[PDB]
Design a protein around this ligand. Structure first.
Ligand SMILES: O=C(NC1CC1)c1ccc2c(c1)OCO2
Length: 119
């Protein structure tokens, strides 16, 4: 029932994501010189360095907020892809599956701890 445990759990998950070769296109903000029309399609850019920095600054209150930003990385890749078979989008799908598999217990434990706190 530790209400704070999610933070280190998220730091360790981000470390795993950075070791995954599938995270390469998402480790830093999308380069507008490489993808000139990016901001014509994507309203809110997001990347894993920004997520890690927000967490380390103490600017996430819960793992649900971190999860929303990580999911935005994947939805941006889906919205920008010219094809469902594209390399970067295909990497986003595998990384998404890996993230979802690992974040599930973080979310469940945090929500359970918070319900216990408010019992
Ligand atoms: O989201 C994309 N790029 C940013 C992560 C760096 C992205 C997705 C699919 C593509 C693509 C780019 O180029 C050809 O197919």
């Amino acid at each position: 029932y530790d209400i704070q445990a999610w933070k280190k759990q998220c730091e360790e998950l981000l470390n795993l994501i950075f070791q995954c070769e599938d995270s390469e296109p998402f480790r830093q903000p999308v380069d507008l010189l490489e993808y000139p029309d990016y901001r014509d399609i994507i309203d809110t850019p997001m990347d894993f360095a920004t997520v890690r920095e927000t967490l380390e600054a103490g600017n996430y209150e819960s793992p649900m907020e971190l999860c929303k930003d990580v999911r935005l990385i994947f939805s941006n890749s889906k919205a920008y892809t010219p094809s469902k078979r594209s390399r970067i989008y295909s990497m986003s799908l595998r990384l998404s599956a890996f993230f979802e598999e690992h974040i599930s217990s973080v979310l469940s434990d945090y929500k359970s701890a918070l319900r216990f706190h408010k019992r």
